[PDB]
Amino acid sequence: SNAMRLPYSWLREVVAVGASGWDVTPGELEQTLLRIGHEVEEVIPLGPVDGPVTVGRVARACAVDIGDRQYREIATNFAVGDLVVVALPGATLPGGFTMICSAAELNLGASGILVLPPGAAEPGADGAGVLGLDDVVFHLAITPDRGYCMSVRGLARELACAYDLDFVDPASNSRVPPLPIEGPAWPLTVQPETGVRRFALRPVIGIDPAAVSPWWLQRRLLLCGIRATCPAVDVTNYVMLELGHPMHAHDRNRISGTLGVRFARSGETAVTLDGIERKLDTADVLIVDDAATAAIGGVMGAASTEVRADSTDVLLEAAIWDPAAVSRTQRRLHLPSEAARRYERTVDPAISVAALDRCARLLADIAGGEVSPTLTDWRGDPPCDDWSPPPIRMGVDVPDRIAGVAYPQGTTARRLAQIGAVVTHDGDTLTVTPPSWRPDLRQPADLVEEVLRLEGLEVIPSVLPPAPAGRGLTAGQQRRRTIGRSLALSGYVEILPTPFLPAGVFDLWGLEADDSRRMTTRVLNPLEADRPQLATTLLPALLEALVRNVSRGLVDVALFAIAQVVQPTEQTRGVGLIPVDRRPTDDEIAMLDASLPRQPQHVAAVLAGLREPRGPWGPGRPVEAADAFEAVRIIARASRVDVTLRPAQYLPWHPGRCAQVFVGESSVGHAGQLHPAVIERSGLPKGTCAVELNLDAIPCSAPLPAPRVSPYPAVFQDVSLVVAADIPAQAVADAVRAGAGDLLEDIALFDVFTGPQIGEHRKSLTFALRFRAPDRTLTEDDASAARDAAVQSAAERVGAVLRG
Amino acid sequence: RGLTAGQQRRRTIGRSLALSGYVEILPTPFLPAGVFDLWGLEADDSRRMTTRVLNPLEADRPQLATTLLPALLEALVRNVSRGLVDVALFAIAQVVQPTEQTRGVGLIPVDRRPTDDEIAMLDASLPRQPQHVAAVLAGLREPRGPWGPGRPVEAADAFEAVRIIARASRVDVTLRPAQYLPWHPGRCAQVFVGESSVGHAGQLHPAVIERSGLPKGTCAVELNLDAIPCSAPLPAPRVSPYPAVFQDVSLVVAADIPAQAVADAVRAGAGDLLEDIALFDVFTGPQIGEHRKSLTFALRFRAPDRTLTEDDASAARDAAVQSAAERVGAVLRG
Amino acid sequence: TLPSTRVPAGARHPIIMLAEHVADTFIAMGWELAEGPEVETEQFNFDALNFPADHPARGEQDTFYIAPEDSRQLLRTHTSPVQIRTLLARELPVYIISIGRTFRTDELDATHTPIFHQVEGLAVDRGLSMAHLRGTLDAFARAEFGPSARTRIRPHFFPFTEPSAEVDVWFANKIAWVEWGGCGMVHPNVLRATGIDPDLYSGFAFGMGLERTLQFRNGIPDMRDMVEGDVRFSLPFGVGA
Amino acid sequence: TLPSTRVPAGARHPIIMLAEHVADTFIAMGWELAEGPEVETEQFNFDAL
RNA sequence: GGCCAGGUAGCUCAGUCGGUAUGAGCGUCCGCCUGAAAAGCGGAAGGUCGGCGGUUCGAUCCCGCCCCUGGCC
Ligand SMILES: CCOC(=O)[C@@H](C)N1C(=O)COc2ccccc21
Ligand SMILES: [Mg+2]
Ligand code: NA
Ligand code: NA
């Protein structure tokens, strides 16, 4: 989770140390945070309440001292003597509720009623004043490049940058006095191959188990979304929120032997602080001793060394874990703890002892303990004493060029120092060493973002770049437009097809087991577990949309779609990671492409009901197979190619009403009426027709016609030819055209006749012919000679007989 | 910035007409000799107020076109006379319509930029030159084939050309009976966008056809694209998941009542529950009475938030019936 | 006045028509359109785009992966891999738009869809700056929201850009500022992963969802109507061209 | 294979289609398309040129 | 991840903790009716009650697992 919550009072406090009197409207602070790159999610005030909301002391139902020697009388987790918040008769709680209140009822936090610690307020004080209901909680979503902003320290530094304020780092040694170092605190061994960068320990001895955290500490924990427990645990969560370094308290008396940081073993378990057993992996980091496991490194402590309500000796832990190891471990067992979320976004390794000393001194103050002057501080082998990242070189005017703004002189150097970097000059080149809490600053582009976001993106002008000499749309892109325009103008409605096939669609289609359409690509994590297969054909998605329309009263439908399919040629095979520090070679690119399933672009359409609506002209016309064939011809004219249709058998189409479509000699798809069994098993309307073509198989064309218009008159003649019923009418037309020669200007079929005059399993076809010469008027004999050659051509090619 | 909205609209209109079977021509700007006398236009018809060329290539054709129809009809005759008798042509071009006698403007010194007033004066001295779209049809509108003998061109095909152009322009039009040469006075519609007239369509007058040597039944359309405003609609449809109710209503009206006026009155009375209305029957049988006609509409009712009862739908239908009685004198069929 | 339309017109889909208008807008500024496969390798969808190895988007939670596990093959979570392919195939300078189907794990309701379409832009040339990015964004905004449209950018984070920003749009036809998309300067790691010298070439990129753009502009209440293919949603938008 | 086209497609004029291709060529390079009247003043047809 | 609450006709939804869901409204079909319609009146069709199993002579209702919506996280 990227969530970060804190109250404005705490944030203003840290900023006001270096800039006395700083105070802004919550609306202004929201705009400033948004302007520098921090997304605010919500700005929620506390309460509010008014009237009789006061603090009382308890002495079921009992009397409550409301102050001034007055007693009013009106469960679970409170004894006699605890300070509580009461709602006297007439009080108005958020919102409109008009009683011992809880943190949830007062709009302050999350079971039981609110119990103020002893000494938090005198019985009778103003409830809204003691609870601090004037405060406002900011809920932020921190991007993963700004782990330093998961704390009051980082967000306060950001505000000081944006308002050009003097900043006092709450993690500094002038603000956290160095406790004495008089010897080791506890023996420990660290396996360096586990990614630990720093591990520090300091104990606190003899704390009062009955002590409770002061109200200002508990209140800040609640507003940040962490429930208070006991002083030892409250200070570790409070310092984590304050400085961004997570802290953990171990019971010193329940640690047996030398502490050890070590990789876990397979099958090894660990009972965490929540009382749940966790299964561990070999890539997990653990803190162990001579007996059991003390913690899952950077995730959560174990119940073995957990601080309890009677703990008196506390060993405090300040460690820096590997971000990748913590992220890999917490996501496996679903533990997005406050510590794990910060470690996976990297934690500043330079403040480990400073946060430790802050924690120990605070615990002794509120619990009456004694801070031991011992300290163990493992800083790697060899020990690391400088946590600064490598320096970055970039030109002084690089942020100016990237932004397109001539910033005043010194802007880049001032802003990069403001965020904590060391900046030196060497001519026109800056050498920038980022601070230890900014591991995201690695190259000049990172530095440019810092200068630009702080100066504000609103100062970058709007300058359209010059237009490059582009080539415009490709031939294929233009064709997809023309096809879409042509189908829509012919009454088709475009849908966006889903790529996930319906469950058992090919079983409903009755396809064979070896049908290539069954060889599908499966998705591992589909939204519907019974629809994991990607579409090899667009028809299932179109037929699904067809059913939706028909089922809702729109029974006369024509739909089309243009989208890619997914057709693998092998089992799912991946290629290994190619190094990102270089360009992949053309062999590696071709290997990447070959590992992907074939994804050609298809066009498809489905039709059902009336193709032509009824009206004052007549009763309309139901969809028939010829309407699907006409959709092919519309697509063909739009693509400026000639197609041929041939009878074929191809499910889910009707075997006697199915055409395979060819361009030249290449098959490009199918069209016609659907099989009545498929329609019945799919709940489709009777007579549904369908088309699907492979656009990638249709070649792009650029014809250059040069017609010459003859000024001479034409000759009209009709020819009737008898053929076997199985002869396609187009084949007869082709044979007539090949015989007639160049005098033939037009040919059109206008009659198909069957009957006993013709003979069983035969048919008569009559074509209208138009002859015209380019250089002369024809005689009738001239046209009849071309007609007779066409008849002889038809006899030779399709067995035609001149009608007698 | 790419193409303007008007340049884009002209492409879309041309694509739609071509896909609907029309063949584009390039119209000549010079009018055929005495074409307005062939049309029988009055001496004061605004189309006769033409700009004339001093030195035309044909001395008998000096005038510039105030309408695209003469050039389209000349190309239609060229096609028909050469054996292509089933034809539908269209054209998109400017016309030349002066508002005064030809008036020139003196030479402006070219050593400087002309002022904005001098520019507006040069523009005001030119005739108005708006963009028009026009079409002509004759012969078979649908060819014969293995489906049947085809269908001859009729006035309704010219009205459909208007609706093709309107859908391409993304504007709503209405059609109203009108008299306007050279159209047939009983088969002529004036086309409106809102309350502004944008042109005419229908069958041509039989006398104009005879005098001009045109094919019988020739139909035509001409619209002023400049009078059609460029629109940019932003629909926000809300698809209702509840079922519809289907009812038909049969209304008897006087024969002169336009069918669209009945549909409009039905829609006005039915209210928001009416999702769709479609005329599917016009009956003038003997049980109806002379000079009267029965119209039957298919109605689709659907609520956005509930399932309707038949009574809910019949209540909206009955209010539509009363609306039609009040507006067009309709009587419920019985 | 009798009805005359014997073959009533259909409709191209409003998302396709918006994509066409967006493409025409960028063509007129000299850009070109590129396309790529929807089933994409993890190399081009994540690795070449500076995504870390343990990034949460590489998990099974947000990205549709192709079975079996650890196949390094997935349905693309953006059209960015199409621009990586173009950067590898074409010579510089490059000004390309990629409009294609994109797949995310969000469920389908009134304001979210798992299958959506987005437009992405990528410009790589000598001396390109954030001013050029903002100029392109404002031109895009005016073309789609009207002459009074203007964009606003705020700092954000994306793995493949540095600096990174989110884009808001102001259209003076609301039924204020609306979140529109993201943008930034092309990260130098992306340029090095394509064989381009980050010291000689700079670049910018942006990305907006088409369904999102259509929803708040036209005021469409239920985005499930955009994807379910009901005829009643498409026909009001006209035939389209 | 029976004929199925009941409404034979028309044609845009080849000169119009060429002008459209020429326009697209220049728009793709950032140019724009402007128009004017065919009946023009002599000032703009000759004198200004 | 919890005990729940939901998945029921073409659409939108009721209802039963074993032998008929006499399911509703609208959608589909037939008749009277009309030149043809619709309404009206009078007749009907259609669900394997979320999937796979368990118990039982017999399960929409009782057991177990899983699929998908939500409420709370
Ligand atoms: C639709 C929401 O996705 C985005 O806007 C973000 C995540 N994005 C992409 O998806 C790809 O193109 C981009 C280019 C520059 C910055 C961000 C993006
Ligand atoms: Mg950065
Ligand atoms: Na047929
Ligand atoms: Na034979």
Determine whether the interchain pair C2/B282 forms a contact, defined as Cβ–Cβ distance below 8 Å: yes
List chain D gaps (C–N > 2.5 A) by preceding residue.
Answer: none
Name the nucleotide nearest A683; use CA and C1'.
Answer: E10
Nucleotides of strand E within 7 Å of the protein's CB atoms: 10-12, 25-28, 34-40, 66-70
Residue nearest atom 8 of ligand 1, based on CA coordinates: C207
Kindly list the distances between the CA atom of residue A303 and the CA atoms of A276, A298, A342, in Å, as whole numbers in the listed order: 9, 15, 22
Ligand nearest to the CA of A447: 2
Kindly list the distances between the CA atom of residue A412 and the CA atoms of A397, A401, A453, in Å, as whole numbers in the listed order: 8, 12, 11
Chains that touch B (3 or more CB pairs under 8 A): A, C, D
**How many CA atoms lie less than 13 Å away from A405 in the CB half-sphere?**
22
Q: Report how far residue A775's alpha carbon sits from residue C52's, in angstroms, rounded to the nearest whole number.
A: 76
Report the Cα A346 to chain-centroid distance in Å. Answer: 23
Q: Residue count of chain C, please give it.
A: 241
Report the Cα C237 to chain-centroid distance in Å. Answer: 22
What would you report as the CA-atom Rg of chain C, rounded to the nearest whole angstrom? 19
Please state the residue numbers annotated as binding site of A: 440, 446, 449-450
Q: Report how far residue A79's alpha carbon sits from residue A58's, in angstroms, rounded to the nearest whole number.
A: 8
Cis amide bond preceding A652, omega within 30 = yes
Please state the residue numbers annotated as binding site of C: 162
Which amino acid is it at A749? L
Placement of tokens 């070590």 in the chain: A262
Region of A647 please: left (phi>0), alpha (psi -120 to 50) or beta.
beta
Q: What is the number of CB-based contacts under 8 A between chain A and chain D?
A: 40
**Secondary-structure percent of chain B, ordered helix, strand, coil, rounded to 5:** 30, 30, 40
Q: List CB contacts of A664: < 8 A, sequence separation 6 or more.
A: none
D3 — contact with chain A (CB < 8 Å)? yes
Chains that touch A (3 or more CB pairs under 8 A): B, C, D
All domains of chain A in start order, with CATH = 53-136 (2.40.50.140), 188-378 (3.50.40.10), 392-459 (3.30.56.10), 475-697 (3.30.930.10), 714-802 (3.30.70.380)
H/E/C letters for each residue in C11-45? ECCHHHHHHHHHHHHHHCCCCEEECCCCEEEHHHH
Minimum distance, in Å, between the CA of residue B244 and any CA atom of chain A: 7
Region of B55 please: left (phi>0), alpha (psi -120 to 50) or beta.
beta
Q: Report how far residue A568's alpha carbon sits from residue D29's, in angstroms, rounded to the nearest whole number.
A: 39
C237 — contact with chain B (CB < 8 Å)? yes
Structure tokens at C18: 């918006």
Name the nucleotide nearest B243; use CA and C1'.
Answer: E11
Q: How far is the CA of A720 from the centre of ligand 4 (A)?
A: 14
Cβ(A563)–Cβ(A540) below 8 Å: no
Kindly list the distances between the CA atom of residue A269 and the CA atoms of A272, A278, B125, in Å, as whole numbers in the listed order: 9, 6, 96
Rounded to 5 degrees, what are φ and ψ at C167? -110, 130
Report the Cα A690 to chain-centroid distance in Å. Answer: 36
Give the burial class of B120: count Cβ atoms within 10 A of its Cβ; 0-12 exposed, 13-18 middle, 19 or more buried.
exposed
What residues in C contact A327, CB-CB < 8 Å?
54
Q: List CB contacts of A348: < 8 A, sequence separation 6 or more.
A: A148, A171, A244, A245, A387, A436, A437
Of A485, A614, A750, nearest to B280 by CB-CB distance is A614
Rounded to 5 degrees, what are φ and ψ at C60? -80, 5
* DSSP code per residue over B239-272: ---SPPEEEEEEEEEETTS-HHHHHHHHHHHH-T
Q: Is the CB of B245 under 7 A from strand E?
A: yes
Structure tokens at A557: 């439908």
C-beta atoms surrounding A308 within 10 Å: 12
Q: How far is the CA of C96 from the centre of ligand 2 (A)?
A: 26
> Which ranges in A244-384 belong to alpha helices (H)?
323-330, 338-344, 352-367
How would you list the strands of the sheet with B196-204, edge to edge?
B23-24, B87-94, B131-138, B219-224, B196-204, B183-193, B174-177
Q: Is the CB of A552 under 7 A from strand E?
A: yes
What residues in B contact C25, CB-CB < 8 Å?
2
Q: Residue count of chain D, please give it.
A: 49
Give the burial class of A704: count Cβ atoms within 10 A of its Cβ; 0-12 exposed, 13-18 middle, 19 or more buried.
exposed
What residues in A contact C127, CB-CB < 8 Å?
401
**How many CA atoms lie less than 13 Å away from A539 in the CB half-sphere?**
28
C4 — contact with chain B (CB < 8 Å)? yes
In A479-612, DSSP assigns E strands to 493-494, 557-564, 601-608, 610-612
Report the Cα C162 to chain-centroid distance in Å. Answer: 18
C130 — contact with chain A (CB < 8 Å)? yes
Nearest CA among C50, C209, C165 for reference residue A143: C165
The angle that helices A411-418 and A444-455 make with each other, rounded to 10 degrees, is: 100
Q: Is the CB of C61 under 7 A from strand E?
A: no
DSSP class of residue D43?
Answer: I
Minimum distance, in Å, between the CA of residue A606 and any CA atom of chain D: 17
Sign of CA pseudo-dihedral A652, A655, A658, A664: positive
Nearest CA among A255, A254, A235 for reference residue A245: A235
B170 — contact with chain A (CB < 8 Å)? no
Determine whether the interchain pair A729/D3 forms a contact, defined as Cβ–Cβ distance below 8 Å: yes
How would you list the strands of the sheet with C115-125, edge to edge?
C32-34, C94-103, C115-125, C202-209, C177-186, C161-170, C150-158
Pocket test for ligand 1, best of C118, C134, C140, C179 (most atoms within 8 A of CB): C118
Structure tokens at A744: 């033939």
Nearest CA among B107, B182, B207, C2 for reference residue A617: C2
Widest Cα–Cα separation across chain D = 64
Residue nearest atom 16 of ligand 1, based on CA coordinates: C183
Ligand nearest to the CA of A630: 3
Nearest ligand 1 atom, CA C208: 1
Q: Report how far residue B323's alpha carbon sits from residue B265's, in angstroms, rounded to the nearest whole number.
A: 6
Placement of tokens 């406002």 in the chain: A136
Q: Which residues surround ligand 2, an ion (CB under 5 A)?
A: A 446, 449
Ligand nearest to the CA of A657: 3
B120 — contact with chain A (CB < 8 Å)? no
How would you list the strands of the sheet with A3-7, edge to edge?
A3-7, A136-141, A39-45
Residue nearest atom 7 of ligand 1, based on CA coordinates: C182
Residue nearest atom 17 of ligand 1, based on CA coordinates: C182
Q: Is the CB of B307 under 7 A from strand E?
A: yes
Q: Which residue is nearest to nucleotide E66 (CA to C1')?
A: A529
Give the burial class of A770: count Cβ atoms within 10 A of its Cβ; 0-12 exposed, 13-18 middle, 19 or more buried.
middle
Ligand 1 is surrounded, with C-beta below 6 A, by C 78, 80, 118, 120, 158, 161, 181-184, 205-207, 209
Q: How far is the CA of A626 from the centre of ligand 3 (A)?
A: 5
Determine whether the interchain pair B167/C239 forms a contact, defined as Cβ–Cβ distance below 8 Å: yes
Determine whether the interchain pair A496/C43 forms a contact, defined as Cβ–Cβ distance below 8 Å: no
Q: List CB contacts of A228: < 8 A, sequence separation 6 or more.
A: A213, A217, A218, A221, A222, A234
Which amino acid is it at A492? Y
The two beta strands, B245-254 and B274-283, are: unpaired
Nearest CA among C145, C116, C128 for reference residue C22: C145
Q: Report how far residue B141's alpha carbon sits from residue D8's, in angstroms, rounded to the nearest whole number.
A: 9
Q: How far does the CA of A612 sit from the C1' of E7, in Å?
A: 39
Placement of tokens 């700092």 in the chain: C155
Structure-derived torsion over alpha carbons of residues A47, A53, A59, A61, reported in degrees to the nearest 10: -80
Minimum distance, in Å, between the CA of residue B158 and any CA atom of chain A: 15
A470 — contact with chain B (CB < 8 Å)? no
Q: Report how far residue C241's alpha carbon sits from residue B22's, in angstroms, rounded to the nearest whole number.
A: 18
Which amino acid is it at A392? I
DSSP class of residue A726?
Answer: T
**Which residues is C164 bridged to in the sheet?**
C156, C184
Residue in chain C closest to D6 (alpha carbons) equals C7
Minimum distance, in Å, between the CA of residue A594 and any CA atom of chain C: 11
Structure tokens at A93: 């709680």
Residues 11-40 of chain D whose Cβ lies under 8 A from any Cβ of chain A: 14, 24-25, 27-30
Rounded to 5 degrees, what are φ and ψ at A526? -80, 155
Structure-derived torsion over alpha carbons of residues D25, D26, D29, D34, reported in degrees to the nearest 10: -150
Q: Report how far residue A39's alpha carbon sits from residue A33's, in angstroms, rounded to the nearest whole number.
A: 7
What residues in C contact D7, CB-CB < 8 Å?
7
Name the nucleotide nearest B286; use CA and C1'.
Answer: E35
B 258-297 residues, CB < 7 A, strand E: 281, 283, 285, 287, 294, 296
Nearest ligand 1 atom, CA C165: 16
Cβ(A563)–Cβ(A497) below 8 Å: yes
Report the Cα A708 to chain-centroid distance in Å. Answer: 60
Q: How far is the CA of C156 from the centre of ligand 2 (A)?
A: 9
Placement of tokens 């519609």 in the chain: B189
